[PDB]
Design a protein around this ligand. Structure first.
Ligand SMILES: O=C1N=CCc2c(O)cccc21
Ligand SMILES: [Zn+2]
Length: 199
């Protein structure tokens, strides 16, 4: 458990980047105080995930193209019990999808809502150093992933594809993002409780 969770902690800290908004959405910090890392064991969600992963693999030259990615949401507790649900997803960069990041600090910008919302419920602060936040570190099946640079408002995956990869560009994205259009293509494997730390 210790080495498995240290690997999660390393992924969480090492993928932090300096954000263009100067910390507006997610707060100002260089690292986190990781409080707890819990493995989510939801058999029904796991099987919904693996059934779809097998299907996608068969449609993508025997390859699921699975990645471990972060997800930030004010609804992590509904996600761990009921799973990711595309019915809760159009106005986003790549449309009506479920978004993930390979940089934990990008997902951190979504923990209190879009653009950070009004921050924590207690102090109404997007840069709250006191209130404990939660992120998910997820197993995500990308399958055949459609590489895109500019905004493309999809309702579903592009024809013949299983996801969209938003790649960084001068005029566009600062960091990558990964988008699925079917909730069963992600499993909320780790629940991370943490605080952002004052630099
Ligand atoms: O973790 C996320 N949660 C919601 C939206 C989002 C994005 O729109 C891009 C990358 C990551 C996330
Ligand atoms: Zn607070």
């Amino acid at each position: 458990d210790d080495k498995e969770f240290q690997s999660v902690e390393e992924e969480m800290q090492s993928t932090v980047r300096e954000h263009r908004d100067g910390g507006h959405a997610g707060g100002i910090f260089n690292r986190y105080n990781i409080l707890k890392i819990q493995k989510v064991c939801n058999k029904k969600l796991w099987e919904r995930y693996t059934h779809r992963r097998k299907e996608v693999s068969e449609e993508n030259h025997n390859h699921a193209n699975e990645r471990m990615l972060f997800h930030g949401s004010p609804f992590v507790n509904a996600i761990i019990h009921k799973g990711f649900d595309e019915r809760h997803a159009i106005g986003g960069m790549f449309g009506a999808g479920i978004y993930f990041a390979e940089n934990s600090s990008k997902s951190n910008q979504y923990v209190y809502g879009i653009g950070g919302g009004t921050g924590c419920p207690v102090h109404k602060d997007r840069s709250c150093y006191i209130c404990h936040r939660q992120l998910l570190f997820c197993r995500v099946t990308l399958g055949k992933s459609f590489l895109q640079f500019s905004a493309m408002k999809m309702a579903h995956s592009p024809p013949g594809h299983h996801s969209v990869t938003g790649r960084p560009s001068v005029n566009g994205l600062a960091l990558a993002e990964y988008v699925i259009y079917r909730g069963e293509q992600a499993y909320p494997e780790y629940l991370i409780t943490y605080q952002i730390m004052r630099p």
